[PDB]
């Protein structure tokens, strides 16, 4: 699929139902999707990725989180904030049962590059499709601006945080991607034709970008000694466009790979 | 004083679920106080300039036209009719039981001016509060950006259409108000800190604003003759920012005054 149809999937099982005075509203027919993310998850689950093989046991849920040094696959214990069915992970108890670090050179940069290329392609494809005065297919247009977008926002947030961990100061992500990190959810019509920022934020961002990210350890267990390793650094807070408040990432923007 | 534009979210009109978890309803909703004030004054016959003369035995609505403000009582077959719980109006049957035109000079401009001043005040306040580096209370910030906004978007749509009917060509509304007319609704976080448009749209709008509106008759009955009067012109379509598709106003952006 090309153009905007590369970023649309059929909304087979609606992940959103809206209710109003006894009526259940009709679910959107489609959802926004970043195909490179779907492909990555599939390859990791099936052990068919060309550069990275998850070695953790698949009898427990596996998550992944970006750190400054690469990509961490991890199995949270039931007490970890990332666990899917108590003090936050700290230097004495990480609440991580096991982990696997993949450094940039060993495949994490290849993964990030594939994700980033797709995300930037989406941003550019939105300009070509919605902002260039070009004739548009009516059905495709309405599929786009009514599409479910919650999963897509989470995919783009994951790509953003990888870009920041790898290269916040040297290859900063564009504001069109940063916005996913400081707004939990953006509706598809705003993604396609609007923004979670305005023009002043655009000029500001080139100047502010080195100051928008706070990092903190992604705690994991020491293998031969008690306590936690503290040297793996994840995104902890992202400064919002008002430059006063932050969006907090309790688990560094981690996402689930398999259950 | 963003709190001037907030009301308690007493009886939310919708509830939303994500993957079967109901989201917490917002504590507050955005509101345009000049709109609430206007409706109350029209209902209670305490408006300083305009008195509705239609019978209150039936529901009363109002709609902007190029020559002012039309109060009307729709019949059950009219698209604006609201029940306790079919062909569109045309030059033969308006489905309007009675109407009252108030010209700009006889009070409609005063009404529009009070609404417009409030809406422009909101737009300017959003800049002062969210884009000026001003210290803000964290709780108040989150109350604003999580607020429900559907009713507010409808209020802003009404002000916008009045601005267009009165002075599309001579005093065009700003894009910060036009956006409410080409989006079904905008969430509060996007209203406060983002937009339903992007930077290129600002320059497009400066050039296009005299060409974005299609008008059509608001059909009302001829009083001495069969059929409908066809010379009262309401907003029928507003061109979206992509410049291809339009938002349709089946009843010219009419709103209910009294039930």
From TrEMBL, chain B:
It comes from the Viruses. This is Nonstructural protein 5. It comes from Bombyx mori cytoplasmic polyhedrosis virus (BmCPV).
């Amino acid at each position: 699929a090309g153009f905007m149809e590369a970023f649309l999937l059929e909304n087979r099982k609606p992940k959103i139902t809206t209710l109003a005075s006894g009526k259940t509203l009709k679910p959107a027919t489609h959802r926004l999707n970043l195909p490179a993310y779907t492909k990555l998850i599939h390859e990791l689950r099936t052990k068919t990725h060309a550069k990275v093989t998850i070695s953790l046991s698949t009898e427990s849920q596996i998550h992944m989180v970006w750190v400054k040094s690469g990509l961490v696959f991890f199995t949270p214990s039931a007490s970890h904030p990332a666990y899917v069915n108590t003090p936050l992970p700290n230097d004495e108890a990480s609440h991580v049962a096991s982990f696997q670090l993949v450094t940039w050179k060993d495949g994490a940069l290849s993964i990030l590059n594939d994700l980033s290329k797709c995300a930037i392609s989406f941003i550019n494809q939105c300009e070509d499709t919605f902002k260039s005065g070009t004739n548009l297919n009516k059905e495709m247009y309405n599929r786009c601006i009514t599409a479910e977008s919650r999963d897509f926002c989470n995919q783009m947030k994951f790509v953003l945080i990888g870009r920041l961990c790898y290269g916040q100061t040297t290859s900063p992500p564009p504001i069109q991607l940063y916005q996913y990190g400081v707004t939990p959810f953006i509706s598809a019509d705003i993604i396609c034709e609007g923004a979670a920022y305005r023009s002043i934020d655009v000029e500001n961002y080139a100047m502010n970008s080195n100051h928008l990210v706070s990092y903190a350890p992604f705690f994991v267990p020491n293998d031969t000694k008690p306590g936690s390793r503290i040297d793996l650094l994840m995104v902890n807070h992202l400064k919002k466009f008002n430059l006063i408040f932050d969006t907090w990432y309790k688990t560094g923007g981690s996402v689930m790979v398999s259950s």
